[PDB]
Nucleic acid binder design. Sequence first.
DNA 1: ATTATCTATAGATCTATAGATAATGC
DNA 2: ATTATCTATAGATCTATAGATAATGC
Lengths: 220, 218
Amino acid sequence: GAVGRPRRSAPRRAGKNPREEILDASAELFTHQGFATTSTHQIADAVGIRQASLYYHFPSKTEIFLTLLKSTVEPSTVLAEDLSILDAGPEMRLWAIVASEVRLLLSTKWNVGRLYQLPIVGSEEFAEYHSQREALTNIFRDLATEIVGDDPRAELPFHITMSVIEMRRNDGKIPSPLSADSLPETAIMLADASLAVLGASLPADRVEKTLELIKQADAK
Amino acid sequence: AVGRPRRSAPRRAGKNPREEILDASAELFTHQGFATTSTHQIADAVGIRQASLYYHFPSKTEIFLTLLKSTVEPSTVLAEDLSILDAGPEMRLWAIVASEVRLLLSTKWNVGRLYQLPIVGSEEFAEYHSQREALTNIFRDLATEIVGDDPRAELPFHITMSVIEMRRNDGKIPSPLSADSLPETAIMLADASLAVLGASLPADRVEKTLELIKQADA
DNA sequence: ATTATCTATAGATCTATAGATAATGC
DNA sequence: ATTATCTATAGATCTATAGATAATGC
């Protein structure tokens, strides 16, 4: 059996331990209703525990949110940095970054890309993340600037990319689990679009090659 | 109220007191969002006591719901009328993108942010909710008419909405309305939207669009 | 007389803490 | 004798409602 006074209701969330369970419940609610609207009771209720019982695992509702926010921002930011610097031309580099971030935002169980864009993040409190967020944004812009020059279109590939957030499911079924063998269709499209808005022909063997860069990046 | 107003005088802008509210509300709701924003915070911004707001509006919900209506309907009617008008699907699509972006750049605050708010889950919100989905269909429909049954039919709407990130939200209007001008951003996004669908650009798309506006105004 | 605001305040939340309690582990 | 949950509540803060009150109109 398990140490500790047994809970009133049986666990309802997927997780190897209460931390994962709570973050699981939290990711669903925060992506559906945002931070402020979601109350610790609903989180508790979702998890199947009393509200106070949360505080043994997380010191504050803000800390829960922070944790989730890290787990999406981090991999995405580093990935762009890792890929940013490679063999090919900026057409190819940008096509990959778009495909790679879309691959990623489709890989998670809940739609955590929706967290970046929430109001709460605007506050100064969450400055470490604006920082990473802008840094990411700048990578794309500069990539795009290498193709069209100083031109307002350079702003677009990033917004095209983030558009998956509006077009993916959010019910705890992963829309496209990761595969070393292939890229999800939707990634192909948004990469392909991101080059069309810059008026640039698609690069060569782009799916075959983008998976190469990911294998590389994964080993790093 | 002849002559320039005092700097001290209530910072808000509008014909009457209700409008002063919605002006205050839009600034707060599009920066911090609905739930994070207290009626107290609104009142202070309007220069009045918290309780007073309840003369003009029933609830904090109602303020917000109103602000939504005030930005959707204008767009929904715009799109619907251009939607049928006699021209090619590309031309129709370009005009809609351009004029939606034109419109989202016309307002004082960035009311497009209210769309991305997740607060719209309530039963009452349904009227707004299904009108948002109607507008969105117009785009999908048009796009599909250019490119068929293709996942790219989703793009033009989202490309359009991206202007929300590219806009200021400090009170100054980014691009005031005009009948002989489209802001550069609306042109860009409209061009992009057609670009992603592999569609040819109409040669006189700007001026044709400025015309269907004038025509659709009266 | 009709407004538009005010002061005051219930009651409905919501976060977090204090301390009891029931399971395992020694 | 350690751990993880529970019950119970303090203290905050927020929406909304009453009923008082300073302006004018008539």
